[PDB]
């Protein structure tokens, strides 16, 4: 299983508009004769570094920009070469997210942030605070509904609450991240995680809730709210739930702070098709018609391409996404991010079960993240 | 020992221009017949709450604004009553420092921040970084000079270094301080204190250095630098040392962050002379001629009175003071500040001696500050 010259294989996560991307691929193939294959492997963010290290894997890998620093450090990504005219077509802050050691290591596609999604038929006025959700849940629970269900298995989803009162990954300083200053066991993080664990131990939420269960619950009107990204909107559209996308609730009077991801496309350093990959990404995908094809499948969020974003920006769901993004922080792209996510994922799982105390769980995560 | 009606007794710290203040007092006495006594007791910030609690003490107490929240909470201070025309004469941010629970509890006099003071004859180009001071000290040490001497006994002086990399007292949030989020044992504080302790353990500085020794050393040219406030300048003037006042050095590429104090004048709630005290403070002291009398004795810093500050602002020493102030933080005035200072004072003393480790010292301070 190697990489053939003269074809493109693209990996993208299963929650994104891979069929729409495949349509852009088929258009490229029709115009050029170059076959484009789109796959969505499980755990692609882990599989890529394993297969790319041996010189194999996809020609193009899509993921949020946070994983890309580590890929690039491991020599798995090729420096990309858009010209000044091309770079001008995307927002500068999107290029920042994909710059690593003064080198662009991927094409930015779209800016993603979690929002609060609520059922307007159940909940005309969404809660402004996390604090009021317990009582709302009790009130709803007959009705026979619940207030809030979202993916508790991945720290991406729980982090906005953890960060609200002060939790953080790595301290941003002299333009760089102090990788020895990790903010996962400070009082803010502890306050956030404690509230979350309390909701679970009091059966306002279930520790086993994952993406699939929460999506089912919201999309069939069993729960009044969920937390998710723009990729989720099209299934809600199909469900016919009358939904709103809004600012996340506050905690201790402060904004929830989602970690902002820029979906990005990197080129496998081991690919003999670097020129083709550049041509596809710049002149097929990163175009109004190309982004529209993907977006129509699953919404991308706020696209990096100025010309198309100017249209999407009029959508109140996009406005809410960017409001939530502004209240959160851009993810760092440093290689240490992988250890951070792993550390936080374990801490949340362990605390939610009652296995470890919040304090003990976060103490452990702090140590793991920082070494 | 009680408080007589028809006289004013003022307490002010011994490092301030108490003789100049006494001159303003004698002017008031000449105009009105009201005797004004100025004293500078030792540990006046501790003695005041002890004596004022029993209904005794000075009619007017001067200290930086940080102690005043606790005084006011204990019912020891009278709400002051300047009118809108008077309030307009001082800078709004100075009034903020003396507001406690929506009530003004003192008259602001001047804004104080520490600066780096250096001997231009020994050291034409002052170090920009804390990191370069060890090597400079070795180079100077014959010569037979030292690089830096400043008061190590009081945390006021060591805090700017401790805060540089992230240390903090109480987290500022919804306009209020989260009194359960104390930042004295995070990685930044630990990094700061560790560097300080290293300088001491390596004999670049002496753990026993206090205000008096450091002032002697600088003012007689034995050390190239000191850290101090504007009140110190007049003795340096007299010493004839060719000195500069400049931005504090950075640590880990970040500004030293001095805690900014607003010298303030409160009225003892137990005083039968509240009207007289108001009259003296508003119409004698807080005037160009009144502040000038004090300033001429020992410089006040950047005065709260707009009209006089517009003159003082042209002094590069004042510019440097305000540059350092802008890089630091205004002290909170909450009652918890007293526990904070006590906690940090002990931690620094204990670590500097080698009694406790930096980690153990700050762990202990963290607990004490937050309870
Ligand atoms: O949960 C940790 C996880 O968070 C992010 O993954 C997101 C991704 O950015 C979104 O595009 C969407 O697919 O949901 C994912 C969460 O399941 C980080 O990008 C990822 O590295 C990290 O492991
Ligand atoms: O060292 C802790 C101490 O710091 C401040 O005291 C300063 C004061 O603000 C200055 O005016 C000058 O007099 O030096 C003092 C340090 O010795 C706080 O105001 C004080 O409450 C605190 O104890
Ligand atoms: Zn193959
Ligand atoms: Zn297809
Ligand atoms: Zn799949
Ligand atoms: Zn071009
Ligand atoms: Zn409850
Ligand atoms: Zn740092
Ligand atoms: Zn169901
Ligand atoms: Zn259904
Ligand atoms: Zn169904
Ligand atoms: Zn921010
Ligand atoms: Zn008396
Ligand atoms: Zn006198
Ligand atoms: Zn005295
Ligand atoms: Zn008036
Ligand atoms: Zn040394
Ligand atoms: Zn807080
Ligand atoms: Zn001497
Ligand atoms: Zn001398
Ligand atoms: Zn002498
Ligand atoms: Zn600041």
């Amino acid at each position: 299983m190697k990489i053939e010259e003269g074809k493109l294989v693209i990996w993208i996560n299963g929650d994104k508009g891979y069929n729409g991307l495949a349509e852009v691929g088929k258009k490229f193939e029709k115009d050029t004769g170059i076959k484009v294959t789109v796959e969505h492997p499980d755990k692609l963010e882990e599989k890529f570094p394993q297969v790319a290290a041996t010189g194999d894997g996809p020609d193009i890998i899509f993921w949020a920009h946070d994983r890309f620093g580590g890929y690039a450090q491991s020599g798995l990504l090729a420096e990309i070469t858009p010209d000044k005219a091309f770079q001008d077509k995307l927002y500068p802050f999107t290029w920042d997210a994909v710059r690593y050691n003064g080198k662009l290591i991927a094409y930015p596609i779209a800016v993603e942030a979690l929002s609060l999604i609520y059922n307007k038929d159940l909940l005309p006025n969404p809660p402004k605070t996390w604090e009021e959700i317990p009582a709302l849940d009790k009130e709803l629970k007959a009705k026979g509904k619940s207030a809030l269900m979202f993916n508790l298995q991945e720290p991406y989803f729980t982090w906005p609450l953890i960060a609200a009162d002060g939790g953080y990954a790595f301290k941003y300083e002299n333009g760089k991240y102090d990788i020895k200053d990790v903010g996962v066991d400070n009082a803010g993080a502890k306050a956030g995680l404690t509230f979350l664990v309390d909701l679970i131990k009091n059966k306002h939420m279930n520790a086993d809730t994952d993406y699939s269960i929460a999506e089912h619950a919201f999309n069939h009107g069993e729960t009044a709210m969920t937390i998710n990204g723009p990729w989720a909107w099209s299934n809600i559209d199909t469900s016919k739930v009358n939904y709103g996308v809004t600012v996340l609730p506050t905690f201790k009077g402060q904004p929830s702070k989602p970690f902002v991801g820029v979906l990005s496309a990197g080129i496998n350093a081991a690919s003999p098709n670097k020129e083709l990959a550049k041509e596809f990404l710049e002149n097929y995908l990163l175009t109004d018609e190309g982004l529209e094809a993907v977006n129509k499948d699953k919404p991308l969020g706020a696209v990096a391409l100025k010309s198309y974003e100017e249209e999407l920006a009029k959508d109140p769901r996009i406005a809410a996404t960017m409001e939530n993004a502004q209240k959160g922080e851009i993810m760092p792209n440093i290689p240490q991010m992988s250890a951070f996510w792993y550390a936080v994922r374990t801490a949340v799982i362990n605390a939610a079960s009652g296995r470890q105390t919040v304090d003990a769980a976060l103490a452990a995560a702090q140590t793991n993240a920082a070494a």
Side-chain angles (χ1 to χ4, degrees), chain A residues 1 3-34 36-142 144-175 177-371:
Chain A
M1 210 216 208
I3 307 176
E4 325 187 30
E5 196 161 342
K7 294 169 202 193
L8 291 175
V9 178
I10 299 178
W11 286 3
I12 185 166
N13 205 38
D15 57 4
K16 307 302 185 326
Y18 56 79
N19 288 320
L21 182 57
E23 292 166 354
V24 183
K26 295 300 196 186
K27 177 187 184 73
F28 188 67
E29 187 173 328
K30 187 179 189 165
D31 291 1
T32 66
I34 297 304
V36 183
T37 291
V38 178
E39 300 176 4
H40 40 96
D42 228 78
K43 299 183 172 180
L44 88 77
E45 80 277 21
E46 302 174 9
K47 291 181 189 171
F48 176 76
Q50 286 166 356
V51 303
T54 63
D56 309 318
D59 297 87
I60 297 173
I61 175 70
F62 283 74
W63 194 262
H65 74 281
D66 68 296
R67 292 285 314 204
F68 286 5
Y71 297 165
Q73 187 64 45
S74 300
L76 311 182
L77 290 175
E79 182 173 354
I80 62 164
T81 55
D83 60 30
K84 191 270 189 302
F86 183 79
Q87 296 182 45
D88 278 349
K89 296 165 89 162
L90 311 200
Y91 296 104
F93 83 94
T94 65
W95 291 119
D96 292 338
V98 291
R99 200 174 291 108
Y100 182 72
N101 295 336
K103 299 188 201 326
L104 297 176
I105 57 64
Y107 287 89
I109 307 299
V111 181
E112 301 173 348
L114 296 171
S115 297
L116 185 61
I117 302 174
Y118 69 106
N119 182 324
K120 297 178 169 199
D121 293 349
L122 291 174
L123 198 65
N125 295 288
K128 297 305 290 200
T129 71
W130 276 94
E131 287 86 344
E132 72 203 82
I133 294 176
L136 179 61
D137 184 56
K138 182 170 181 304
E139 263 298 292
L140 280 171
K141 266 175 311 190
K145 308 292 173 187
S146 69
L148 175 65
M149 290 189 55
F150 66 102
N151 186 7
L152 299 183
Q153 310 311 305
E154 288 288 335
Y156 184 74
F157 293 85
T158 56
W159 190 254
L161 169 60
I162 289 169
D165 192 37
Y168 61 87
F170 301 102
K171 178 110 116 53
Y172 193 61
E173 295 173 0
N174 243 40
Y177 291 97
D178 179 357
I179 73 167
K180 294 213 273 185
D181 194 339
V182 173
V184 307
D185 79 337
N186 60 24
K190 283 180 266 199
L193 186 57
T194 298
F195 186 80
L196 174 58
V197 168
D198 286 342
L199 290 175
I200 293 163
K201 279 179 185 172
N202 297 141
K203 299 287 160 165
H204 298 301
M205 298 201 301
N206 294 329
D208 70 327
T209 297
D210 59 17
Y211 193 90
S212 153
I213 294 164
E215 178 177 52
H216 169 85
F218 189 79
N219 294 4
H220 303 272
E222 295 161 356
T223 190
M225 296 180 289
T226 190
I227 290 167
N228 217 325
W231 52 85
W233 301 338
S234 67
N235 291 344
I236 312 171
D237 288 342
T238 297
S239 81
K240 301 308 181 185
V241 161
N242 183 11
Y243 72 98
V245 182
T246 196
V247 55
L248 289 162
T250 57
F251 178 61
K252 297 178 81 174
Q254 306 153 82
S256 285
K257 305 177 66 191
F259 244 146
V260 176
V262 180
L263 178 63
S264 305
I267 302 172
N268 192 330
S271 168
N273 305 296
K274 299 186 181 64
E275 300 83 359
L276 283 173
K278 171 181 182 176
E279 174 77 349
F280 174 77
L281 297 167
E282 300 185 10
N283 302 308
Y284 282 69
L285 181 55
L286 283 160
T287 66
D288 289 351
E289 53 268 33
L291 297 185
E292 177 179 58
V294 180
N295 194 77
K296 269 174 28 58
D297 183 6
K298 299 293 175 86
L300 286 161
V303 302
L305 184 69
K306 296 180 185 174
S307 59
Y308 190 41
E309 176 60 16
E310 295 174 6
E311 299 301 347
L312 302 188
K314 305 164 187 172
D315 186 338
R317 306 173 299 166
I318 296 296
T321 300
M322 292 306 293
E323 179 186 350
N324 281 307
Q326 296 165 3
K327 281 158 171 180
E329 309 291 358
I330 187 63
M331 288 185 281
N333 69 8
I334 67 181
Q336 293 76 17
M337 283 301 291
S338 69
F340 165 75
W341 285 125
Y342 181 98
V344 175
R345 170 188 290 111
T346 306
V348 180
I349 291 182
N350 287 342
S353 60
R355 191 173 327 288
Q356 306 195 260
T357 60
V358 169
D359 291 330
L362 294 172
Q366 223 281 336
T367 310
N368 299 139

